[PDB]
Design a binder for this molecule. Structure first.
Ligand code: CLA
Ligand code: CLA
Ligand code: CLA
Ligand code: CLA
Ligand code: CLA
Ligand code: CLA
Ligand code: CLA
Ligand code: CLA
Ligand code: CLA
Ligand code: BCR
Ligand code: SF4
Ligand code: CA
Lengths: 80, 165, 733, 74, 37, 39, 144, 63
């Protein structure tokens, strides 16, 4: 499975979660930003690696990173 | 002479090449009349060919075994055997025009950089300022050397963006 | 479920698609990336791989010797090495019809055989092989040596025979033994073979294992060596009327420095080669006692490295810490080795065509063309590999904390300046070379060849005049008879060297003109651009402004996605990928130049090259179009000849190249969607859905696609040029 | 504008009048080049006492089919 | 001597071209699809 | 007229006028000085 | 809040069928089932091609992968303002609820969630690959 | 009151940032204990088209 990581520079803008097309990211409470929210990746087993979340991240540099890992049926997005 | 080459004024292949070009032009000219436009055009081309060959031989160019001229790129050989007009003087001429264009562009960029919207001055050229800088760029080597001596030509290391290594 | 293959990667083994097979095949040699890999095990695996490679090399050499002794005509080629073509091996193809059988039946054989272009005949004949029995004995000996190497590779992996980790890091001992033993003793042994076998065999005396212990190589018998009167060994050398292989006009000297070439064979003297190997053997042996290993005396490479920092601070910390970052990094050592190997390979190609070392090698035009092109392409690939491994070193083994302030860190400190200056050099060379070529083309098209720009290469011609060539007329150094440099060699080697360099019938410092100047600038452009791509990819491998964390993604990865405007071909692997095309283009230009200049020299009309090498139309018509008339005529409706195989290879390479263009232009997505449609079609087809796949069919990955397209491009390129070169040179001569 | 240019070139820089008298030997041409930097060599002898570039657009045949017999009409 | 017979190519070429590649291909294909316990 | 001059001051119009002027100058120079190969 | 139970006897939208439907993976590995509540009949676009008509009330559909179900979920939420939910169904009959995981959509923060795979540092603070070399397998410097 | 003054110009010291060694105008400084309270707006956008970012107190130097 691919490795999805969230760094402390996350501002809790929730744009990466909305851009995720396979419901991998979510928002959890936090105390490091004004929004008091932080992105989380508790379902990385379903991530394909489209990197839409990285495109939707507005921090410089990015707060969410995707590292291509072991390929499987869910990671390759195969309907067969 | 230099590198076993002979001057074009004393090369047999050079004269044979000139005779070949004039022969094919004259052969093409024999198919037309005498007071027609193609005949006058061909005669003009022949006169241009004669003037070109005479000027090349008059310039003192060095020809090879193929009858074609050769250029001397070594500064010592060019200044020692009268070949500075081939590659030396045009080199300095291009250096002057190149630095001229570069300095004009640099001055325009630095001038519009302190304005409110430099991107508008980049897509829409400010013709008066550009014309003034184009006319003032004649002293580009002097201005560039004075800029280099003052230390204002280059930017400091701390003000330039770099990779995270 | 999880499959057994691959055994070194559980993640790849769990992959249920066809990507598992391709990735397992492409990552088998990546020992550092396996499961449960340590440093000691890594070095042991590389040791075994080295032994296996040596066994393969020796077995291949034995196979060549065996086929030349069996199906070759070496016994008849040695008697007439000017009018007899060498035979590689026989051909047994059931697809051949009667015309193919009689067309390939050439070279005095009894059946269809292949005419060799590798030049092993001249080399073996020069070193001493005369009969097929010698080749058979050599093949058997090399096969047994290969078997011993294979057994050694298997033995070193078993317990009680695996070397320790500290043994593999003994740089001082390994370098002393390679400089003194693998380099010096081997060269000394070659000198012994040349003096004891090659030199007596070239003079009509058969010296073999049955009589070398009773035949004296010199009439004085080792006495001048012990008495210090070595000058007696150069007395009575081979005269100018010596016939190779016979005793007519043969001398008695064994170590001379006459220089030049042999008048008949047009190759280097055997005595000079033996003397050369002896001198370099003495130098390498002496150099083998430079590092301290176990006897107190010697040096430590770490001390020499740490004691080389300038006081002005220009190099920062100098070379401090370079010993640890090199001894602990295998990619750094591999990159250094590949860089040196590629440079030496190019040196070999240039020195062998200009200074022929094997007898009757200059007359074989096909051998020269094929050997030079082969070595140059191999050198280009090896150079690209050196830079690729350098990038791998930066991503995997570079440690900024250990390399703080040294030259290595300072390379990444000003990498932008290096890439920018390389870009400026490449841009200047490209614009000027292309501009001069287009200008000459327009002048030739407008009927005014005297108007084209023809700059005389006065610098290289000046160097040639310094070497002794008097055609230009500079008359200095070895060209002037009153110079000390000239008068100091007139009694040792200058007569033969000057006689060979002033002769325009050989490849020793050929005459150059404006066409040579222009093509040399094109060569410089190719070298600088290839270096720019490789250097930029190695320095930007750890990160740039677009990808600040590229070091955390490995050496090879597809991309960073379409975000930030697009990150296609952002990895260092992609930089190497784009650099392979430039390497192939550069080697293509150098091989085109070599082939055309030598073709015009062998045809007796160098003026054709001198007059048509200044405009690209001359290169396209007088070289590529004029020399392919016989190649494409190998098979036509009127029949076929022995040149039909090269025509088929020509079209074969063109097809492979065009096939590579597909993987290079079309990308994954379209293919994956098409594959999905095919999956549905197979799953919904009766009498066929009963046969289901064991691996889910998927499209090739982006990295795999780049590699496949590059492989097809390179294979088609190589096969097309090799076929055209051999066919044109063989048909013309 | 493109069609008007083709007709103007056929009316002032062509040999249509000469081509009409010999449509089997005179090559059609409707473009002339200025005598600069040696490009005048492109003004080949297309026939009918003219020097130009042989055209392949087929405008001469089309004008002959419509009944055009003079440069004034073009 | 070490010289092979006259019929050696007629037997070794079809072997190396059809016997050895078929056996090697079948063995490798069976090995790749082996399921781990 | 201010908008028209601003449109004429854009990058493509200025590039067209400048390249036309430079090309015309080079063409006229080669016309009055045919075949210049040296100085 | 309670985890919903899959009702197999749920009406499905009127669709004529297509070739982009389920494959052998639905019977051999797994498949997905999306259910939602529609206030009225409406023609919607199928993620696998074609236009179907969602019925009034409960609606159930089957898809080959999770991406298709989430794409249809996003389409129904953004075009008709509905609340869909889906499960992963195995050939043995096991049903696993997937989205929304806690009954609340992940775009908004909800109490009880625990952040996972979060690094309490930035990208520039990651270690060099030489420090993560010679591990059990290929490990990236961001995995630690 | 902690941090740079609103509207001033500061230099970015974050190496992985696109605006490293570049000047940017200060927008607002958060008064909480967040890791990156300084907000810096730049005239030139990054590759993603963003012109604002959040930096720490020690990540910005007055220039
Ligand atoms: C871009 C690289 C470049 C290269 C490859 C050369 C190469 C050469 N130059 Mg040179 N030169 C260059 C740049 C270069 N030059 C530049 C930028 C200048 C401007 C300062 C000069 C100015 C120059 C002069 C004035 C002369 C040469 C000369 C020469 C030729 C022989 C001298 C030599 O090799 O020493 C390198 C050259 C120099 C360090 C410049 C000083 C000249 C040295 C001291 C040589 C003079 C001694 C004597 C005249 C040599 C002639 C011996 C014999 C033939 C009579 C040689 C082919 C000599 C020549 O052949 O005359 C026709 C000569 O006199 N060059
Ligand atoms: C103000 C204009 C200007 C100036 C002073 C420079 C200066 C420089 N450039 Mg550069 N460049 C420019 C414009 C300019 N460039 C433009 C418009 C482009 C896009 C085509 C490039 C693309 C470019 C590349 C790819 C490279 C350079 C490089 C370099 C450096 C090497 C010298 C060189 O001649 O390279 C070559 C110059 C060019 C290829 C382009 C020249 C274009 C014209 C002649 C410049 C003026 C055009 C402009 C429209 C005029 C201003 C209008 C204004 C008065 C109204 C040098 C410091 C090299 C480098 O990296 O540094 C070592 C290098 O690799 N430049
Ligand atoms: C005198 C002792 C000695 C000798 C003879 C060798 C010899 C060798 N060692 Mg070794 N080694 C030694 C001591 C020695 N070692 C010690 C003491 C240590 C421990 C400190 C090591 C540790 C060690 C390691 C770790 C490895 C080796 C390896 C090798 C092999 C290198 C393979 C190769 O590159 O081909 C031979 C290379 C040459 C002959 C040099 C060629 C020179 C240039 C490139 C060519 C020029 C020649 C000429 C122009 C070309 C001929 C033309 C024509 C005839 C074709 C080689 C056979 C490698 C190995 O194990 O392979 C199995 C390797 O992995 N050694
Ligand atoms: C002494 C030479 C040497 C050695 C020991 C290595 C060793 C290594 N290289 Mg390397 N390399 C070299 C030279 C060398 N290289 C050269 C000369 C080049 C330039 C071509 C490269 C370019 C290169 C790249 C770009 C990469 C490596 C990588 C690697 C590492 C593992 C990958 C691997 O080898 O798996 C096995 C290798 C293969 C399966 C080869 C692929 C198949 C090729 C394309 C065969 C195609 C030929 C074709 C079939 C010919 C037939 C035609 C005919 C039928 C008509 C490994 C440590 C990789 C790495 O470091 O991992 C991150 C990596 O990405 N190398
Ligand atoms: C014939 C094909 C071709 C050509 C011409 C080039 C040319 C170039 N490559 Mg490239 N390359 C190619 C194929 C080609 N490549 C392929 C197949 C690959 C593998 C993917 C690569 C991969 C590659 C890489 C990775 C790199 C290059 C780089 C470069 C540049 C090198 C600098 C130079 O030489 O300056 C000379 C400039 C030229 C030759 C440009 C041509 C000049 C034109 C003809 C003049 C304009 C005509 C006229 C005035 C206006 C006409 C336009 C009209 C519409 C108005 C150069 C522009 C390097 C680079 O970017 O350098 C900084 C670089 O890193 N190449
Ligand atoms: C000459 C290079 C080349 C070749 C051979 C192909 C071949 C093919 N392309 Mg392709 N293509 C190319 C260039 C090429 N393309 C390039 C440069 C691009 C980029 C624009 C594309 C983009 C492209 C697209 C977008 C598509 C294709 C498709 C196809 C396939 C069509 C099916 C077919 O033709 O039936 C037969 C196959 C062939 C004619 C290929 C050669 C087969 C040889 C002659 C048979 C030899 C058999 C031999 C005995 C094998 C024994 C091996 C032995 C060693 C054991 C086919 C395999 C289409 C497809 O996917 O399939 C429908 C598709 O949509 N191509
Ligand atoms: C690497 C060296 C090499 C190469 C490239 C060739 C190539 C060839 N051989 Mg030859 N052969 C070799 C070594 C080699 N041989 C040796 C050392 C011997 C002595 C035992 C022979 C004995 C031999 C005979 C008797 C004949 C050939 C023949 C042939 C031709 C037919 C194809 C064939 O493979 O036949 C068969 C090849 C063999 C039986 C040799 C295999 C034995 C070695 C030890 C195995 C090597 C294993 C290999 C390295 C593992 C990897 C290969 C592959 C599985 C990936 C072909 C051109 C035939 C011929 O003349 O055609 C006209 C023929 O009759 N060979
Ligand atoms: C690399 C080894 C190799 C060898 C040794 C052969 C040998 C042969 N091929 Mg073949 N071929 C090959 C590779 C090879 N091919 C490849 C790679 C391709 C794809 C490009 C082809 C494509 C091909 C075609 C299209 C044809 C051949 C044909 C033939 C036969 C020639 C017919 C003839 O004139 O004789 C006389 C014929 C006979 C005496 C009949 C012999 C019957 C068979 C061949 C032997 C008995 C079968 C045997 C028991 C089973 C062996 C399978 C084994 C691996 C388990 C011949 C025996 C022709 C053929 O099949 O003949 C009808 C033909 O049509 N080949
Ligand atoms: C970088 C490549 C390059 C170079 C160095 C040259 C150089 C030259 N070309 Mg050429 N050309 C090139 C590329 C190049 N060209 C290309 C790519 C093409 C195809 C489009 C052509 C097509 C071409 C033609 C058709 C002709 C030339 C001609 C010339 C010569 C004219 C000199 C001149 O204009 O008078 C002097 C220029 C000036 C006095 C202007 C000076 C600028 C200001 C006003 C003064 C500042 C000076 C301080 C000159 C030596 C002409 C010639 O006669 O050849 C000998 C000619 O007919 N070129
Ligand atoms: C990336 C990288 C790298 C690098 C690489 C490289 C660096 C490559 C290259 C390159 C090359 C490939 C080089 C080479 C060179 C050479 C030289 C440097 C030389 C020389 C010369 C001389 C010195 C000579 C002299 C002389 C003459 C002139 C002649 C006569 C003789 C005499 C001797 C006198 C590595 C891996 C390390 C690691 C890190 C990263
Ligand atoms: S888009 Fe980036 S900053 Fe915004 S919540 Fe997601 S990870 Fe955090
Ligand atoms: Ca013997």
């Amino acid at each position: 499975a691919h490795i999805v990581k969230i760094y402390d520079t996350c501002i809790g803008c929730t744009q990466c979660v909305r851009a995720c097309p396979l419901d991998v990211l979510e928002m959890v409470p936090w105390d490091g930003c004004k929004a008091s929210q932080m992105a989380s990746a508790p379902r990385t087993e379903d991530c394909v690696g489209c990197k839409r979340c990285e495109t939707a991240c507005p921090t410089d540099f990015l707060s969410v990173r995707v590292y291509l890992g072991s390929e499987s049926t869910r990671s390759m997005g195969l309907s067969y | 002479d230099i590198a076993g080459l002979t001057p074009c004024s004393e090369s047999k292949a050079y004269a044979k090449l000139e005779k070949k070009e004039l022969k094919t032009l004259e052969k093409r000219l024999k198919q037309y009349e005498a007071d027609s436009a193609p005949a006058v055009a061909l005669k003009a081309t022949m006169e241009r060919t004669k003037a070109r060959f005479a000027n090349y031989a008059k310039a003192g160019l060095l020809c090879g075994n193929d009858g074609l001229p050769h250029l001397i790129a070594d500064p010592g050989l060019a200044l020692k055997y009268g070949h500075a007009g081939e590659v030396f003087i045009p080199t300095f001429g291009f250096l002057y025009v190149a630095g001229y264009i570069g300095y004009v562009g640099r001055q325009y960029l630095i001038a519009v950089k302190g304005e409110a919207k430099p991107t508008d001055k980049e897509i829409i050229i400010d013709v008066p300022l550009a014309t003034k800088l184009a006319w003032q760029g004649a002293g580009w080597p002097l201005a560039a050397v004075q800029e280099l001596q003052r230390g204002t030509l280059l930017e400091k290391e701390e003000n330039i963006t770099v990779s995270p290594r | 479920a999880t499959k057994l293959f691959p055994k070194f990667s559980q993640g790849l083994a769990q992959d249920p698609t066809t990507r598992r097979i391709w990735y397992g095949l492409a990552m088998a040699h990546d020992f550092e990336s396996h499961d449960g890999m340590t440093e000691e095990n890594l070095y042991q695996k590389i040791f075994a791989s080295h032994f296996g490679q040596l066994s393969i090399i020796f077995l291949w050499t034995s196979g060549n010797l065996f086929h030349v002794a069996w199906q070759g005509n070496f016994e008849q080629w040695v008697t007439d090495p000017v009018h007899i073509r060498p035979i590689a091996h026989a051909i047994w193809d059931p697809h051949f019809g009667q015309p193919a059988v009689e067309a390939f039946t050439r070279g005095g054989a009894s059946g269809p055989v292949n005419i060799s272009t590798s030049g092993v005949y001249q080399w073996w004949y020069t070193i001493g092989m005369r009969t097929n029995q010698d080749l058979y004995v050599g093949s058997v000996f090399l096969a047994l040596v290969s078997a011993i190497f294979l057994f050694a590779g298997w033995l070193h992996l078993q317990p009680n025979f695996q070397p320790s980790l500290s043994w593999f890091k003994d740089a001082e001992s390994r370098l002393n033994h390679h400089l003194s033993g693998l380099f010096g003793v081997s060269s000394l042994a070659w000198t012994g073979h040349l003096v004891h076998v090659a030199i007596p065999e070239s003079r009509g005396q058969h010296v073999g294992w049955d009589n070398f212990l009773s035949v004296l190589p010199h009439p004085q018998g080792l006495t001048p060596f012990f008495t210090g009167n070595w000058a007696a060994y150069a007395q009575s050398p081979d005269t100018a009327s010596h016939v190779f292989g016979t005793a007519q006009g043969s001398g008695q000297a064994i170590l001379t420095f006459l220089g030049g070439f042999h008048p008949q064979t047009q190759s280097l003297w055997l005595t000079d080669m033996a003397h050369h190997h002896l001198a370099i053997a003495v130098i390498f042996i002496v150099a083998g006692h430079m590092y301290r290993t176990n006897f107190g005396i010697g040096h430590r490479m770490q001390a020499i490295l740490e004691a080389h920092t300038p006081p002005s601070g220009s190099l920062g910390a100098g070379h401090k810490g370079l010993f640890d970052t090199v001894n602990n990094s295998l990619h750094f050592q591999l990159g250094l080795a590949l860089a040196s190997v590629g440079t030496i390979t190019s040196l070999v190609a240039q020195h062998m065509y200009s200074l022929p070392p094997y007898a009757f090698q200059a007359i074989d035009f096909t051998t020269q063309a094929a050997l030079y092109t082969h070595h140059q392409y191999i050198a280009g690939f090896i150079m690209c590999g050196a830079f690729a491994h350098g990038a791998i070193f930066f991503i995997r083994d570079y440690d900024p904390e250990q390399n703080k302030g040294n030259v290595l860190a300072r390379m990444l400190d000003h990498k932008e300046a290096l890439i920018s200056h390389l870009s400026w050099v490449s841009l200047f060379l490209g614009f000027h070379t292309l501009g001069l070529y287009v200008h000459n083309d327009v002048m030739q098209a407008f009927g005014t060849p005297e108007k084209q720009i023809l700059i005389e290469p006065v610098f290289a011609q000046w160097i040639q005049a310094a070497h002794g060539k008097a055609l230009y007329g500079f008359d200095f150094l070895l060209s002037s008879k009153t110079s000390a440099a000239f008068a100091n060699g007139q009694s040792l080697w200058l007569p033969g060297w000057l006689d060979a360099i002033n002769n325009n019938q050989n490849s020793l410092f050929l005459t150059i003109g404006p066409g040579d100047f222009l093509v040399h600038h094109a060569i410089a452009l190719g070298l600088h651009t290839t270096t720019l791509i490789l250097v930029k990819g190695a320095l930007d491998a750890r990160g740039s402004k677009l990808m600040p964390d590229k070091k955390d993604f490995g050496y090879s990865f597809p991309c960073d996605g379409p975000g930030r405007g697009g990150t296609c071909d952002i990895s260092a692997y992609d930089a190497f990928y784009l650099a392979v095309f430039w390497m192939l283009n550069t080697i293509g230009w150098v091989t085109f130049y070599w082939h055309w200049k030598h073709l015009t020299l062998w045809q007796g009309n160098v003026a054709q090259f001198d007059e048509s090498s200044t405009y690209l139309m001359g290169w396209l018509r007088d070289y590529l179009w004029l020399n392919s008339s016989q190649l494409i005529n190998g098979y036509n409706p009127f029949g076929m000849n022995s040149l039909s195989v090269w025509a088929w290879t020509f079209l074969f390479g063109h097809l492979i190249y065009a096939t590579g263009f597909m993987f290079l232009i079309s990308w994954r997505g379209y293919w994956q969607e098409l594959i999905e449609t095919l999956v549905w079609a197979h799953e919904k087809t009766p009498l066929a859905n009963l046969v289901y796949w064991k691996d889910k069919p998927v499209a090739l990955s982006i990295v795999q696609a780049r590699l496949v397209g590059l492989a097809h491009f390179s294979v088609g390129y190589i096969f097309t040029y090799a076929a055209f070169l051999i066919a044109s040179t063989s048909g013309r001569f | 504008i493109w069609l008007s240019g083709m007709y103007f070139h056929g009316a002032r820089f062509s040999n249509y009048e000469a081509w009409l008298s010999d449509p089997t030997h005179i090559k059609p041409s409707a473009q002339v080049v200025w005598p600069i930097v040696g490009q005048e060599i492109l003004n080949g002898d297309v026939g009918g006492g003219f020097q130009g570039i042989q055209i392949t657009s087929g405008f001469f045949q089309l004008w002959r089919a419509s009944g055009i017999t003079s440069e004034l009409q073009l | 001597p070490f010289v092979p017979p006259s019929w050696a190519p007629s037997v070794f070429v079809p072997l190396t071209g059809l016997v050895l590649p078929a056996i090697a291909m079948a063995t490798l294909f069976v090995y790749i699809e082996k399921e781990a316990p | 007229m201010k908008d028209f001059t601003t449109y004429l001051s854009t990058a493509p119009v200025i590039a067209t006028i400048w390249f036309t002027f430079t090309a015309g100058l080079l063409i006229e120079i080669n016309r009055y000085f045919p075949d210049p190969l040296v100085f | 809040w309670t985890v919903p139970t899959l009702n197999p006897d749920t009406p499905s939208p009127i669709f004529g069928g297509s070739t982009g439907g389920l494959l052998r993976k639905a019977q051999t590995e797994e498949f997905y089932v999306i259910t939602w509540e529609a206030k009225k009949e409406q023609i919607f676009e199928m993620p696998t091609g074609g236009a179907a008509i969602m019925r009034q009330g409960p609606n159930l559909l089957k898809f080959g992968k999770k991406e298709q179900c989430l794409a249809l979920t996003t389409q129904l939420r953004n075009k008709f303002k509905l609340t869909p939910c889906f499960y992963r169904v195995f050939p043995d009959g096991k049903v696993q609820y997937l989205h929304p995981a806690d009954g609340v959509y992940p775009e908004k923060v909800n109490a009880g969630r625990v952040g996972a795979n979060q690094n309490m540092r930035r990208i520039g603070q990651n270690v060099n690959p030489i420090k993560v070399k010679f591990s059990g397998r290929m490990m990236s410097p961001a995995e630690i | 009151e902690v941090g740079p003054k609103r509207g001033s110009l500061v230099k970015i010291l974050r190496p992985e940032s696109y605006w490293f060694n570049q000047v940017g105008k200060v927008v607002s400084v958060d008064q909480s204990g967040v890791r990156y309270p300084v907000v810096v707006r730049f005239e030139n956008q990054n590759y993603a088209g963003v012109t604002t970012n959040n930096y720490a107190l020690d990540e910005v130097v007055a220039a």
